[PDB]
Symmetry: C4
Subunit: 85 residues, 4 copies
């Protein structure tokens, strides 16, 4: 058990509410790199090729914005990846 793996599991399980609970904690802890890395693996490994591609746009946006505003593209992507096939 750690937060970043449970984040991933909740996204694999299509659980928006849990994924965003964990996202908020990851954001507040402030390591943007590992969120970004994780979301790209999930987008490519677990998920819809337009959705996979879009995870990269959202990560570039998160990286250009930086924390705290990075939470906006990331929240979007999390829900995107949760509702996806």
């Amino acid at each position: 058990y750690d937060v970043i793996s449970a984040f991933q599991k909740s996204i694999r399980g299509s659980d928006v509410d849990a994924a965003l609970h964990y996202l908020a904690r990851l954001v507040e802890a402030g390591d943007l790199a590992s969120i970004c890395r994780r979301l790209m693996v999930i987008g490519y490994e677990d998920i819809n090729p337009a959705a996979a591609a879009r995870t990269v746009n959202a990560v570039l946006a998160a990286e250009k914005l930086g924390l705290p505003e990075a939470r906006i593209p990331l929240a979007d992507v999390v829900v995107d990846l949760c509702l996806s096939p």
Copy 2:
């Protein structure tokens, strides 16, 4: 009251004419970074996930071109985001 904020409200309000009025002014002033930052936030927050992703491409184009030609992709995504859901 602030130009960059009024720019943001214009786009949320779906007002192309006013959004473009403010863009031309942010452009004249040379603050490429704040335009780009605001567009990505609006794209991911207020908005059509393809439209969200496409703000990143536009911003990349803007950054690679630099001002003054950056106004071109920027005006394009301003209109796109205005007319979007």
Copy 3:
């Protein structure tokens, strides 16, 4: 008259053959940055938002490949932009 403006005009006029005629010459001359800048301006100015956004992907691919191989993404996009609605 220069070739890069004539290249731009051909794409505006949806003329695949002329645009590829010019691209090949621009590719041979080898100023990749100038070709990339112009395609992004054409993509966002003259063109279909998905097609405008794809010019960025192709330019990124062209920069990663470098010349001579950059001509592959570049040709694909000149065609994409030629056919695309305006």
Copy 4:
């Protein structure tokens, strides 16, 4: 004959299994840049314009992640391009 061109040929021939077999070997060898180069060329030369663009995103993810985990977007693109 070499692995990389054989890799390309099997993607050009729509052979998912062989392409994945070559990828795993290219991954084992540790040279990401070469995989990335070939993928972009196939996607642009042999191929949807959306499938072409989308290979650049996969490549960006691959470079951002590095190997070993870069194998994840790369496998996705190989399959994507095979079909």
